[PDB]
Amino acid sequence: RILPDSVDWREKGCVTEVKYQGSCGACWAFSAVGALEAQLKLKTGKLVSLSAQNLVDCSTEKYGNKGCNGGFMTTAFQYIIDNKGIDSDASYPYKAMDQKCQYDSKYRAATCSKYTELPYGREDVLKEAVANKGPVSVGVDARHPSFFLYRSGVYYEPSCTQNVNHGVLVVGYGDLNGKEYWLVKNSWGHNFGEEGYIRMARNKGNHCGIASFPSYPEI
């Protein structure tokens, strides 16, 4: 099938403002809520930031997650399915620490009915999902100073591996003078990268593991 040469879900009103995780390893939770935020907009027309803190505090050991010490987007989604909801960010705001679970259905802002995992390393399948389903949660290998110091352009790091350690959100793809890239929303605030985003090399052999473990939820 025909796919667009480039996609940017921010232009479709499906991406909330960039968040700042602070000294808490909650990137997995931010990735998961970002993916679901897009699906909530696609279903209801509302663009609402969802509570990463809710996942940090409540999608814990039964889901294999360890709060500020890391987790998984897939089992974050499973928590939202099991729990029959996730709170809005406004009602359950982010504190960058581990807290008791404070979920309240009074402030439910979204639900989740399923999630899909994509095949390891398949950047073609990732492209199809980004084009036709929405932003996709992914892991990357971020354990390189070049990643934290990235300012602009298309990011390529020869030392990168396909082993992921940082959860982020693919919100589009494109090319910068024929250098193909993934448009990636991070959770390191607006001062990271290009106003909180990093363009990562695409079709360069699963660079930094971007397509190692993609997943996306549906409502």
Binding site: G25, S31, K66, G70, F72, M73, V164, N165, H166, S212
Partner: peptide
């Protein structure tokens, strides 16, 4: 194969 997204 998936790594928790710890040593950070």
């Amino acid at each position: 194969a998936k790594h928790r997204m710890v040593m950070w």
